[PDB]
Design an enzyme around this catalytic site. Structure first.
Site, short mmCIF file in Angstrom:
data_model
loop_
_atom_site.label_atom_id
_atom_site.label_comp_id
_atom_site.label_asym_id
_atom_site.label_seq_id
_atom_site.Cartn_x
_atom_site.Cartn_y
_atom_site.Cartn_z
N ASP A 181 0.78 -1.22 0.00
CA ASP A 181 0.00 0.00 0.00
C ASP A 181 0.82 1.29 0.00
OD1 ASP A 181 -2.66 1.30 0.20
OD2 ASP A 181 -1.94 1.91 2.16
N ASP A 234 -9.30 -2.26 1.44
CA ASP A 234 -9.36 -1.71 0.10
C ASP A 234 -10.50 -2.34 -0.70
OD1 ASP A 234 -7.20 0.12 0.26
OD2 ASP A 234 -5.73 -1.42 -0.23
N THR A 277 -3.76 4.74 -4.85
CA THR A 277 -2.81 5.62 -4.18
C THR A 277 -1.49 5.65 -4.93
OG1 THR A 277 -1.99 3.90 -2.66
CG2 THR A 277 -3.89 5.21 -1.94
N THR A 278 -1.01 4.49 -5.37
CA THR A 278 0.23 4.45 -6.13
C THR A 278 0.00 5.24 -7.42
OG1 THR A 278 0.84 2.26 -5.29
CG2 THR A 278 1.94 3.01 -7.29
#
Lengths: 518, 518, 518
Positions: free
Chosen positions: B56, B385, B89-90
């Site tokens: 994450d 998630d 997020t990445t």
């Protein structure tokens, strides 16, 4: 497992590339402001508080204490460009940096470095063929163009205030010491001497068709001025000679204390007597001259100077026509040189010797003047460049327009060469071509113009009007560099692209940096 | 003239832009191999020695002790993306970094940051439009798409081994706690509890239509298992109540030493008697339970648990249908909740309470098992998630293919928008469009595919076949993401582009960095 | 003879003037790049690592840790400007520095500071007259101009991307809370709340004709949404009250243990029953709420919230129309306020309470959303200015063109005023007037335009067309600001000159600086 010593720094792959490229880029950026007609200067101060104020890229990079290895490698691009063509030292470094910047974009696109490198080599080699093709062949000694090459060189430097005078001095100097073998000229810059003296202004600088030497007349009673001087050049000391083999006088009777003393005096008087007999009224000696020798020299009305530098003796010979003789005993009238006037004159209060009015001097001197020592030194640096670019054009009767015209021309043609080659190599060739545009670009930038706009126009106008279309920084728009007399030696572009290309390719091949602890 | 304290460092203009962009880029480059189905994980050890192993981006950038100001800003992007959509997020950070990289190419071309910023804003606003247009409207509670969404979310993480089971658990859990008011679903993730116990393997994780509390039955003589449980929830302590106002007992005769003692015993007995009289056979208490109350509770065959977390009380209420009563005195049968089975079980030799088989639980628990603490922790992160994306899709009724498909559509379309906008703005719009390609590019990169070629084939196939064409890191070629079932909530991309772009623009407007001495 | 301790620094005469003036000038040059539509931002990191990213001069100078005394004095210029007119903090600072720079030219001329000071005061006083005369009187509530004011205010700042939305919200907020007594409007900015939550983008920012509180509903059984809510506002804790005078309970019989316990229970219930009796379905309490009161509150289907900030309680009163009651027992149906909807909503995963649809709200809320926390903070700051300039215009129905038009107008006029004063004071008045040109000059400069040319064209055009002519930074030429809608409040220029001049004069009168050792 401990393989390398503690303190050893190391970067590999992208890390190595990113840092090497960034350091070469920062160095290039640092000096791009010295580029062109609106070029600015730098004040460098070393650890000893010694000051250097200059516009010269090579000098700047040589005088600054650089740390990063990639940065140091960029010093070599400037130094080589300098030795080879004089001007273009900033151009080479700036192109090198830009070449690496465009290379990184392809690296980040995951294009293998050898492919990038292959493309760059191709582009660099095609650029040399293009420069030879578009090179304007000119008359090796056409004072007109030569004077233009000189003046362009001096523009953008501290001494540009007197570019006309300085250009005249440089062109004249090179023409005079130039030697024509068979239609092709060859020039040894060692035959042009630069003498510096603070005082007056740069305006008073001049070209002496002979030699100016920082020395004094050895004896007070000797003439301080000789009209049509008959010049003798001797490198051996005018003193009592001793054998090379060890020797000592063995005295056995009181009458010998005087006989030997008189013999040494006689040996000394004969040397001087011999000189006089040849008709020489001026003598330059490399080594010293004993007091007794000075006495007879004066009595004869012969002007003499001692401890003259070997390099000066050589210039004296080439200018006056005299022949340097090792031992006085071999001096003959055929050996004497000529000078319309040889006179001791004071500059800034300190005595000097002027050997001027020589017949057809093969060596010459440019006497630099100026309100300050620092002004004096920068003027000298600029004269060195000016005399070198003039030299380049006399040895290679080829010139090119400036203003970024050639790089724009190369940019356009290399772009088409890329299409012929295709593949990822084309991506490399195109990037190489686009990199060449920093010259036109930073020229505008430094002038305070709008980079994006100027490029669009110059490239467009250039496409419509041809090879001579570059950027006129003073006017703020495209223009025919040729019509304006803004030109430079073909060698400048050629060497710049060569040094910039090979440096860039070398840095690009590095993917592992290992530095020990200092 | 000193203006700033020593130790203060400062960067202006190009320097500032260069340092900020490089830091942001490096941070983005640091998290990019965690992206996609071939994504890898990181191991983070803090100052104390605690270890975090995760995939994450949000968790990674939060645990790392980042120094540079620009790097810290990227943390905000991932963090905000995580609260809003869970996944992406990445993706957000990586686009953020590429956006800045492409911007610097325009900065280096001397394009004013004001222009770049305006162009980027235009592309960002336009991107949201395109996204809303190409979004695939689906049935808010469609089982099939929900599972695809959950499964796509889990793949590429440590738990992908059991993506089917975990996707099943995630979807079922969200469906069970979803609140439909008027065709529009609303989910409160606080109604989904994650309980972890190392032991067994991940395959043994399960969904409990009820609650699992990390607590023991307070008294040894109470039942450990209760079939058709009538559950009471009390938050007040089952002990002798004392007034709020200060009070003291004044004894004036021996008989009172026993009468007050017995009165306190009576009060305590009455609390329990009252509970028993409602028919409750299981009692969950927030505060404590006096030993005597425990004793009487046991005599009644009532299972009690004390010091239960407020959050656990509320879930028990939502799961069992019981009503939290503050004072025992107010407890009535109508307040009791139901549970097919309430039982104390030992997981990894430690006692826990299971409240399962509830009627229509509005709060549920996913019990996570695993062969290690670190494994369970990462499975938990993956489930948070999955439940979040399955949630995004029930509140919004829109999904999008993944595999880089959306970013490829956007690039193509934004590239055309640039044209109609024209000028320098168009340059920025084009660079923004191209920036979006790092997603498709890093997906192939992480998979070991030739980035350059994959990108050409994907864009080709997409233009021919449409929206669903993306990269399949497994097949190693373009493919229809829609058909493969590789989709993600539309909110993932919408938010990613919003945080990435607004963050990039902000950094691009910075031309001065002033940092104090720490 | 020692008079001052060692470490004491001292500067007299020209030294003191040079120092103070150079420090003030540098501070000014430091914030000038934040000026105008092309203005840029600064990133500030304190000793603790906190990061601030703004374009706001007042915030910048307030965050920086300045050492030099003259520099600190410049901070006061910006803070006052910010408190009085919101916008124009950079303008005030930049003009103060320029005023000082121009004044030092007269100091070098040996013109007594007393003369420069007199002249500057004369020019500053006239400037206010000129401003009052050329000010464009407008309708204090004319929506169109108001929106132009708010929008002009937002341009050049990070949020300019959404200036239309944010301008509308600002104008709306200000209009809705403005209070007209007798044709004269008065606005209390405390009636406009700025609530912010990262998530979404800045496009999702909105105006709530009510209040948004970062509080949750106290009990899980209370309603999460109340339609036509009847709102009660209590600032006393719903708990067992105690006397101000010391008091203790003296228990003498066992039955008093329950009687007092029961008495306190009845006191809580009576409080809640009383509230229910008014018909209130939503209650906001400033202090706490005992669990038992919560229970009964929930049983009446009444939504409750505890620990509401005093300032929030006050905004709820003005928005809903409710009257704040201290003692619950004094609450009556007439004290109840109204709201179309009171509902708990989650933002970025955190629960918040929305009170919207209020009749004629005398207090309002602007909810700010965004991709990052730093973006949101900057938006808020931009909004504080926008609402401040809108207020200035509603309180002073006067505006002015921007783009450097007022300062150009002043330069021209003050230049003439100098002529009618004459003598040495006149030199000072001319320099003051000349100084005002840094606004037009820095506006052009920040755009990257040619400063000298733009000043000639703007002043020229201005002389021919009138007051509204200023510099169009985007189009790069003079333009009619009034027609473009580029305007600002009259108060901005007035306060800017007042603070800039009163500060410059003060520094100008200093001929001695005595600083101790810190």
């Amino acid at each position: 497992v401990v393989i390398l010593p503690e303190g050893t720094q190391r970067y590999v792959g992208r890390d190595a590339q990113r840092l090497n490229i960034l350091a070469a880029r920062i160095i290039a950026e640092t000096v791009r402001t010295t580029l062109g007609p609106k070029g600015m200067d730098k004040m460098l101060v070393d650890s000893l508080g010694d000051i250097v104020v200059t516009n010269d890229c090579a000098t700047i990079l040589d005088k600054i204490d650089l740390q990063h290895p990639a940065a140091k490698m960029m010093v070599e691009v400037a130094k080589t460009q300098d030795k080879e063509a004089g001007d273009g030292t900033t151009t080479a470094v700036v192109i090198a940096g830009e070449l690496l910047r465009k290379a990184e974009e392809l690296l980040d696109q995951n294009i293998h470095p050898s492919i990038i490198t292959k493309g760059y080599a191709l582009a660099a080699e095609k650029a040399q063929e293009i420069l030879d093709e578009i090179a304007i062949r000119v008359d090796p000694d056409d004072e007109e163009t030569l004077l233009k090459i000189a003046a362009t060189s001096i523009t953008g430097k501290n001494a540009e205030s007197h570019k006309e005078l300085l250009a005249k001095l440089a062109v004249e100097a090179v023409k005079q010491v130039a030697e024509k073998k068979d239609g092709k000229y060859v020039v040894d810059l060692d035959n042009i001497k630069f003498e510096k003296k603070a005082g007056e202004g740069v305006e008073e600088s001049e070209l002496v068709r002979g030699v100016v030497i920082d020395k004094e007349v050895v004896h007070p009673r000797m003439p301080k001025r000789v009209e049509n001087a008959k010049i003798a050049l001797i490198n051996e000391a005018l003193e009592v000679k001793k054998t090379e083999t060890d020797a000592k006088i063995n005295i056995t009777s009181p009458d010998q204390l005087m006989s030997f003393l008189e013999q040494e005096e006689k040996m000394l008087k004969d040397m001087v007597d011999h000189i006089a007999q040849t008709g020489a009224n001026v003598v330059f000696v490399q080594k010293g001259i004993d007091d007794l020798a000075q006495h007879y020299l004066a009595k004869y009305g012969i002007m003499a100077v001692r401890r003259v530098k070997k390099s000066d003796m050589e210039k004296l010979a080439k200018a006056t026509g005299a022949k340097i003789v090792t031992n006085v005993k071999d001096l003959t009238p055929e050996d004497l040189g000529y000078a319309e006037v040889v006179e001791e004159r004071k500059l800034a209060g300190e005595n000097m010797i002027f050997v001027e009015g020589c017949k057809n001097p093969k060596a010459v001197t440019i006497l630099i003047r100026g309100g300050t020592e620092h002004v004096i030194d920068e003027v000298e640096r600029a004269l060195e460049d000016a005399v070198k670019v003039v030299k380049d054009v006399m040895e290679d009767g080829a010139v090119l327009p400036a203003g970024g015209a050639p790089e724009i021309e190369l940019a356009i043609r290399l772009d088409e060469y890329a299409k012929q080659v295709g593949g990822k190599e084309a991506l490399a060739i195109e990037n190489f071509a686009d990199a060449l545009k920093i010259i036109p670009k930073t020229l505008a930038e430094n002038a305070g113009l709008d980079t994006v706009e100027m490029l669009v126009k110059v490239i467009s106008e250039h496409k419509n009007r041809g090879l001579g279309i570059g950027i006129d920084v003073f006017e703020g728009k495209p223009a025919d560099m040729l019509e304006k007399g803004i030109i430079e030696p073909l060698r400048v572009k050629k060497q710049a692209i060569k040094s910039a290309s090979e440096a860039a390719i070398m840095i690009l091949r590095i993917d592992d940096v290992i530095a020990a602890k200092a």
